[PDB]
Amino acid sequence: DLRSPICCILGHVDTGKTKLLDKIRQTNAGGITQQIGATYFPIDAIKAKTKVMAEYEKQTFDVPGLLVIDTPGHESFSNLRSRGSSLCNIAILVIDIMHGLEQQTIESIKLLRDRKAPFVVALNKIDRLYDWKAIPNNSFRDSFAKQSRAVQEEFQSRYSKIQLELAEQGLNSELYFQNKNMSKYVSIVPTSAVTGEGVPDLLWLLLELTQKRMLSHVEATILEVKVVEGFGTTIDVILSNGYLREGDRIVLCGMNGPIVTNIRALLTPQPLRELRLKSEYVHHKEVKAALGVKIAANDLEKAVSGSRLLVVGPEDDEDELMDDVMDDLTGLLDSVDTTGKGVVVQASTLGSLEALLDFLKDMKIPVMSIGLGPVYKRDVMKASTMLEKAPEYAVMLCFDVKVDKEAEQYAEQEGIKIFNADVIYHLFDSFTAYQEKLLEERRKDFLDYAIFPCVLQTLQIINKRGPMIIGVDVLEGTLRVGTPICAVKTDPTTKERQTLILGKVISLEINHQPVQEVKKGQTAAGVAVRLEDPSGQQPIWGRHVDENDTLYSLVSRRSIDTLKDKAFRDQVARSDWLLLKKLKVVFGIE
């Protein structure tokens, strides 16, 4: 009697996903089990629910029952174990028949098609068919055969459209009973959360997709880390294999290293509604696989949601298991830049983190460090070290995490942008938008400060002042409008150095035409350079500067730095960096 299949149902509220789950549960007598963080369906109840399916299909019951996890968050969290551990044996994707594929549904598809996780689609809301005549809790095929051609038409249209919209997302799909290959195809089960129609179909199909196509070792997964009034910090877990017994020495991933503890309590909620003030929850000496269960213990405070859970055995070495649970994150931790400029990243679950990191890897946003849970001054201090080196990356990319008042108030002192939202977009738009806004400010400052190299030979002086106009040959580089031109003169002995700024280029004329720029080689003509007077006495031609003095764009330490950022991406040539090299020699810049 091996372990129950695990089913994750996810959908947006609008789709009716929560109403569907409620209708699935349907209490009205041992009772349906409302286990902590999951609902348990005993095979008996399943047979009872699916009796009506006998009309259409072979019924098989090779499993003890079924485990369903309602939450989209915990579907994110069931995706938190993710690639390393698959949490659900299958997913039930809910879509509104009236509305077709909606933004979120698109995402959920991509998400499932990422973990390679198998899924079925509940085409919900069929009760809203315009002339639908309801047969509560019936199988879909039976209700459908009893519907009018008007409804048969409407259904075919909406269905085959949604089928189409799915095709557009990469999915071949079919009504479940009509699919030649379950693989490389997606089953579609019409349902109504209102009348319960089609639920029987869905229940059947889950058993069929799990029992054949899909133990001593203990498989446990941390769904949630919660402070309980009488127990301090607890972990809510889903147990897929084996037993948990009170006193059991467990290991789990913590945000400050591997955590080892002993099970003080195994708790589930209380069957009596009346019992549960005095009773609270029930305590168990031991519990078997296929259930969702709260563990009380010491040292859980920094437990990481999404962690695998291990029971240390007689022959097992503790220190090697301490190694094992941490492995999922360790893989994640090693990817990061460490001592390299990058944005800091923080998340709620192991999966939320993996997802975010994977997404950023594809953008190619570098990542200095990663973290989990509540954001503190400690964590935002990691980002601090990027204010001078790479200010754009002076930001935290947080997903689904509370931030401290102290830490947010602290991130206000410095210039730390904290990004915090449920989905990437908000970060991606804020982050991307912030990065562009930063360039917007950077560009305005940079253009004045920035300066390309050029070396000019004066051919002859056209106008000595008012304004100075020089006829030149560009020897090296790019002479452009805005560029400040200067002479470098060393008194033979006394002065040992100099800078004589003649002006900034107003306009450039070659061959009777305005030009905005002249690169070495562009012409042979010689170019008249009109120079805007600099502030403070312009050197005097003949007296101070003359035909023989090679003149160059005025470059400086500041000039050179401003080239490196914002300017650098496309504008500079290698020839121009090489010229800069030589200019520093002339200007005495290190």
């Binding site: 050179i560 490196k564 650098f568 290698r574 960096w577 090489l578 090299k581 520093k584």
Partner: peptide
């Protein structure tokens, strides 16, 4: 003229 090779971190 001996076109390579130089960095951008040195200066």
């Amino acid at each position: 003229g001996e076109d390579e090779e130089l960095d951008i971190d040195d200066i």
